[PDB]
């Protein structure tokens, strides 16, 4: 029954239980294999098992297309270490080793249980006939497509080889299809289903972007008597969660321009808010020194342009403030995301200025025209503008903040529990909005 999967999990993968109860649900649908399934789970190790364990208990051959071999090799090495018959087709392994595997597949009852191919090969006239015989011999049990987003021009890593993977699914009617990606706008997910030719019902397992501890709010730079003071206060607010504890935690601040980043560090530092500046304009030596201090809470605060780069996400990041709007809503999610990794209460804040908005507006406009002369008009050109327009909408339009993030991304509405500005005090929101109506010009 389900008893099968439980035993195989601990017997082969040496895991007492599934990491996430979502994982459990996902894997079970793949094991049923009644349904094409889609998994937008993150870099957390959960997604792989969702096609790995089913592949074993399938009693047929489990192909897995993966775009770069870096990713493949990591797993195949660990898979082997768990006494599994797995085989990678990467241009990396020799023109002779390749002839040995092509052969194995062609004979019936082949040794290969799991073939990690690359998209490139999977499409080429070179690989097609061995493929054909696997299908006809009803040897193909699952066709997995990792980094699916690659199928959609909206996704950054568009890989047209992946478009042939769609006509391939229709040819392999008997074999089910499992697509996976870390993150996907519903826009992207809708392209996936279509260009990959999935069979409805597709069963979907998408981790929600909403997180309990994160208290999101928006302020407007037009409407602050002392903009630096509000920030000082907000940094003090988020830090020192326990009065008897004094200073507790650390936090981050973001800045489109290098220069403005430096400015803010000093403003805060003078004000008692002990804070350091950090950008790509600096030499690397500077950065690793600064990061150290922040990492050890020598300096409880840092200020980092659009270039901190998740070097580490630290446990007790109590706050993340954006002095300016980030370049994309996604951008805001990721950036804010670095906060509150430890699950204890944390604050995310955006400081919105129509001044900022129009600054970034012509930035992206001019560097898009810069690529249009370089390439031409393209699907993804409009997408860049849109990705940012969503963040402007997030601040300008009143609404529970976690839900606006969930909408852009494609989660259902989350349970805020009085955990954002619009949810906590619907009215103070109305107040400051109708404020920016007047302070529009």
């Amino acid at each position, epitope marked *: 029954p389900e008893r099968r999967v439980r035993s195989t999990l601990k017997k082969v993968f040496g895991f007492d239980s599934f990491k996430t109860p*979502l994982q459990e649900s996902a894997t079970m649908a793949v094991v049923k294999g009644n349904k094409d399934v889609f998994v937008c789970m993150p870099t957390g190790a959960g997604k792989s098992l969702c096609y790995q364990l089913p592949a074993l208990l399938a009693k047929g051959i489990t192909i897995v297309v993966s775009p770069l071999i870096a990713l493949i090799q990591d797993q195949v090495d660990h898979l082997l270490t768990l006494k599994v018959r797995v085989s990678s087709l990467n241009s990396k392994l020799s023109a002779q080793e390749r002839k040995e595997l092509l052969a194995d597949l062609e004979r019936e009852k082949p040794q290969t249980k799991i073939l990690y191919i690359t998209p490139e090969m999977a499409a080429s006239s070179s690989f097609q006939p061995t493929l054909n015989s696997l299908v006809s011999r009803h040897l193909l049990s699952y066709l997995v497509v990792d980094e699916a987003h690659c199928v959609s021009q909206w996704g950054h890593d568009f890989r047209p080889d992946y478009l042939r993977l769609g006509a391939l699914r229709s040819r392999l009617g008997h074999a089910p299809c499992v697509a996976l990606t870390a993150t996907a706008t519903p826009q992207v997910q*809708e392209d996936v289903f279509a260009a990959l030719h999935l069979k409805k019902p597709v*069963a979907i397992f998408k981790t929600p972007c909403f997180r309990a501890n994160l208290f999101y709010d928006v302020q407007f730079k037009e409407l602050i008597s002392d903009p630096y003071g509000n920030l000082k206060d907000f940094c003090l607010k988020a830090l020192g969660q326990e009065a008897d504890k004094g200073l507790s935690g650390c936090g981050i601040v973001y800045c489109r321009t290098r220069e403005a980043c430096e400015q803010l560090a000093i403003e805060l530092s003078c004000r008692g808010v002990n804070a350091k500046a950090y950008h790509a304009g600096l030499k690397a030596s500077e950065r690793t020194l600064v990061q150290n201090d922040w990492m050890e809470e020598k300096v409880p605060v840092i200020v980092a342009t659009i270039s901190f780069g998740m070097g580490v996400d630290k446990a007790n990041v109590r706050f993340v403030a954006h002095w300016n709007i980030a370049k994309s809503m996604a951008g805001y999610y990721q950036e804010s995301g670095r906060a509150g990794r430890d699950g204890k209460p944390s604050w995310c804040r955006l400081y919105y200025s129509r001044n900022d908005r129009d600054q970034v507006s012509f930035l992206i406009r001019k560097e898009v025209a810069k690529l249009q002369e370089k390439r031409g008009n393209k699907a993804s050109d409009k997408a860049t503008i849109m990705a940012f327009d969503a963040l402007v909408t997030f601040c300008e339009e009143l609404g529970c903040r976690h839900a606006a993030i969930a909408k852009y991304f494609g989660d*259902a509405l989350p349970a805020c529990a009085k955990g954002c500005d619009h949810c906590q005090n619907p009215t103070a929101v109305r107040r400051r909005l109708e404020a920016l109506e007047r302070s529009s010009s």
Partner: nanobody
Amino acid sequence: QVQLVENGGGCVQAGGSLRLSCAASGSIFSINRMTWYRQAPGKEREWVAAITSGGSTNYADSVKGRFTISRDSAKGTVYLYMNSLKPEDTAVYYCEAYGTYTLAPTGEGEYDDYWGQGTQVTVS
């Protein structure tokens, strides 16, 4: 799973008027295209009209002027106003829920097509 349930048909005279309701229950997120199909017994199943999620809409040539669909985007439910009715239009009316992305907070969801039962429309 999802429920598409129809309402608001009956009988009426030549040149008359009715309004038809299509109601999707459950944990929906979005529906690519919702379409009204009429089954005239003794005839070909006929495409009536349809509304994309984005508010774009399209009508059959025969019913162009006379019919009009709409979403109470909020109510999560769409309507077909059928005025200047003719004997022609006598049929069972159902909707196709194409591209029905359904999802929950647990993260567990499905992309599916859903069909409604239909409601009965008779015109002198």
